[PDB]
Amino acid sequence: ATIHVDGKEYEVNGADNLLEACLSLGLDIPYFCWHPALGSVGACRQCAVKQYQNAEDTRGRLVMSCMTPASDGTFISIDDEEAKQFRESVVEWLMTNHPHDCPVCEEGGNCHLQDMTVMTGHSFRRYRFTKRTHRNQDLGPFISHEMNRCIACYRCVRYYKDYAGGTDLGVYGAHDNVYFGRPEDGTLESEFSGNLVEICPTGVFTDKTHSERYNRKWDMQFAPSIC
């Protein structure tokens, strides 16, 4: 397949969607609800690009890159002004209810939401109203729960239920009171519940064992090892 992103021609796999095709080419499109192992659902509306019908097209149309196939002869723009404004607006909408928590959040410096807030260029707050809050759950000795930081990207439920086959995690409630957790307090029963601390793009699910002796990602000494 052949796509044209911002006037540059690229050869991609036609079976891929536009988001993974552009991310494989080194282009930076912000995204929340898409994961390579989970597929596309089009929830967070962060991955907007402007698709044109032909090469001689000025209007275009905002589309979700994760839900759009990277078919042959596609024409899209990432750095289109309207697409950039919409992606910044989506980040701004996610920031309206987000808690003032980065210094005391274990995801700080390792946070996908922080990276996409910086990437869209959104640093000015004009929202002045109240922020919604949530009570937390006890999820056992391994996973710490903090639902204030949730951006409702549905990656936890998709991984845990559809991928991992777990049954005790779900989404409850409604419009902006969507709650992601267990129906009651207790230990997460899946043998693969620990991957939530990397699946979740925010600091909702965190490593409690790390949170005991916490340090930031930049302060770590890492090595490649085998479990």
Partner: protein, 588 residues
Amino acid sequence: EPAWQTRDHLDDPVIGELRNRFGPDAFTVQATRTGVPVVWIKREQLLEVGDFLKKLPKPYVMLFDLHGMDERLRTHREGLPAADFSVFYHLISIDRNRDIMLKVALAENDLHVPTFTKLFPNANWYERETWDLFGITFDGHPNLRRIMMPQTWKGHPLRKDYPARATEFSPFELTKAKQDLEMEALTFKPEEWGMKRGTNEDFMFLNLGPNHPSAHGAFRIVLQLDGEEIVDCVPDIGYHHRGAEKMGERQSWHSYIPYTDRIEYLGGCVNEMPYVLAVEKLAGITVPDRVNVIRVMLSELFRINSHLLYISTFIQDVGAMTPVFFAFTDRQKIYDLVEAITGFRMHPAWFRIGGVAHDLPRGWDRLLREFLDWMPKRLASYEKAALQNTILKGRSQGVAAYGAKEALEWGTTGAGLRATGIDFDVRKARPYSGYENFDFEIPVGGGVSDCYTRVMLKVEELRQSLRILEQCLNNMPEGPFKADHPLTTPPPKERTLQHIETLITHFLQVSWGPVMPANESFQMIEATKGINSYYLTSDGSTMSYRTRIRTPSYAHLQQIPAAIRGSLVSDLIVYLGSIDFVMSDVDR
């Protein structure tokens, strides 16, 4: 179109002249944010291109800079020739008020370039430093020895595989280097340093360092003397090398600013200014007008501080020991204002990417008004007490004189260049930081650069800086002290303290660092001692891929043997006192 926009500069007449002379396929034009045309030349055509630029109708008369770059780790090299290493040549035409950056690509195995010393004599020290820090050999160089590191140094520090950090201290190596220090007077060979006729049976040799009791720093000059006459002299520098460029590759864009302070340590905010302007070019930031006026005010305060120290130390070097006390009292008045504004005296580190660290504190205008009332009578008293002394004039007038051609061929800038009658100040020729909104004059000399002429030019520059400070006091814009750009590092503190998106931006900017998109930027300013410049290469990361700092004291120290040859040693001391250099500027 903003001033920070990426441009190819294909509309420059020099590009058309090079195309007509050498052909369209002889070079590659690179689009940068440096503001100058960047032209990649083949290595075998470098001397021809340099000669052609030297013989233009309004020729490129000054080699502003010459250095190297390790391109092996550079990932974003789109639109660039294949290169493991590269050597760049920054040339300035004053008649065109233009400049061009030639670039030569080098393979890793074939690291040799023809020398530029037959066209520009300052290429000697520049190529010695490029050989020292990058391992690039220059063919035809008269003496290609190390100039920063000692001669028995292994490796080339500015290469990307050289570890930046300090090695383990060993007393054995210290004792060995002490033994070489004691045996240097016995095993002195007068051919490694580039001299000839090493004892006509009367040419004695003298050493003037490396323990210098003065504020300009400590460095060795080995003198070949016929009685009291200086037949030849080479300076031994690198005794104050701090690896500042290498640290530029090891610090974030924000956390490098205090290191920019300590390049020319009598300059402070003047040293901060070209770095933050070049980073703002990389970030695409246009600062507001109040930021421009604040940075101009602090730059002129530090320029007056540096000029006061320079004039007092020159008067002390002549022999009058009294005015330095009063000049440091005036420096204390300046430091009162600077301490109030920035919280620090000598290295304020107060400029920021996109603005300044804080707003001006309430009551600063009283301190500025008090200093502006204090300064002129003290300056006139210094003039009448020491600068109009005929003994000082006899010590200074006619000593170490050079003309416009000698200043041009050695890269001399600042008061030493302008005392030859060449009107070239960056604040007027290539205006920056809103210097066009100020009414001030540029003092120029009659055509001869003596010690006395340079000192009087610096006195006139001090008076013009006082005029700029008066305009700064009278017309202060009301507005922000930081730009509203998302890459303004750090964001305004109150919004960080109460807004989550601002807190996120601050969190990532102070920890991982601000992300500059991959580009090259350049900013040249008129520093307190000449023209200072930052050339920054970003590879798209939170750290500089390459930080090249051009300082004027390097060029002035290299100019020394061409201006002092055939003079006395007291004249050499007076010349060193009138150059206005610090050794941290030379070595950096």
